Design a protein around this ligand. Structure first.
Ligand code: B6L
Length: 222
């Protein structure tokens, strides 16, 4: 089992790398590519309908890679179809929000969007500054940890594989898989001497509440 745990760490980290949408080194190298004043004004002038359509398109692309990530998790495919859809439906966007911190630059408070970095003001046309400021603030706190790609891999696996999600039939089987991934996570943190990030992780509520507030607005504009 101790070998099982290590094989699981390697597998989880491998599945994420194959389904990480953009390479980390590419996001970091693009940080100097910042939307100009003209380009920002262009985005602020678009209709709220234009911005929602572009965001939903990009959030939907991101979700697809999160689905491919789940298909390659060790025990995800051997869960019942009902449970798979419950975990993805409740989890996919939570994982996207966590992945996004890779694309957040805490230096100048910008996120990667449509090929360049821009601030919260890019999204002004949406008319929901509170909601956008929540995404940037959440990303900022996450960025403080300097997550490695493997830490993202293991942590987002635990975001997906949550046995407390309502609507599970094989609750026992998911609680087992979560347990294994919990050990994979705590084990790799031992080996990389990064155990200190555990205390600092987001509360299980916080990711739920924030993602809830966002499916609400996007459902409206769909
Ligand atoms: C991830 C794998 S990656 O390889 O790290 C990665 C990271 C960035 C990209 C490019 C990208 O797509 N960037 C992006 C940034 C922010 C938003 C975004 C846009 C709008 C909203 C809302 O409108 C919501 F309501 F829709 F939530 C909000 F919050 F404003 F209200 C929330 C958002 F996160 C969407 C796409 C591609 C792959």
């Amino acid at each position: 089992s101790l070998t099982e745990i290590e094989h699981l760490v390697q597998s989880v980290c491998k599945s994420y790398r194959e389904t990480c949408q953009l390479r980390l080194e590419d996001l970091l190298r693009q940080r100097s590519n910042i939307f100009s004043r003209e380009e920002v004004t262009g985005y602020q002038r678009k209709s709220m309908w234009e911005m929602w359509e572009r965001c939903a398109h990009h959030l939907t692309e991101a979700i697809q890679y999160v689905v491919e990530f789940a298909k390659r998790l060790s025990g995800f495919m051997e869960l019942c179809q009902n449970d798979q859809i419950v975990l993805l439906k409740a989890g996919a966007m939570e994982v996207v929000l966590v992945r996004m911190c890779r694309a957040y630059n805490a230096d100048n408070r910008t996120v990667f969007f449509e090929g360049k970095y821009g601030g919260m003001e890019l999204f002004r046309a949406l008319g929901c500054s509170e909601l956008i400021s929540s995404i940037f603030d959440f990303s900022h706190s996450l960025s403080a940890l300097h997550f490695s790609e493997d830490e993202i891999a293991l942590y987002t696996a635990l975001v997906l594989i949550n046995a407390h999600r309502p609507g599970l039939q094989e609750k026992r089987k998911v609680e087992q898989l979560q347990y294994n991934l919990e050990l994979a996570f705590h084990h790799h943190l031992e080996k990389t001497h990064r155990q200190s990030i555990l205390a600092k992780l987001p509360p299980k509520g916080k990711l739920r509440s924030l993602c809830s507030q966002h499916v609400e607005r996007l459902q409206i504009f769909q």
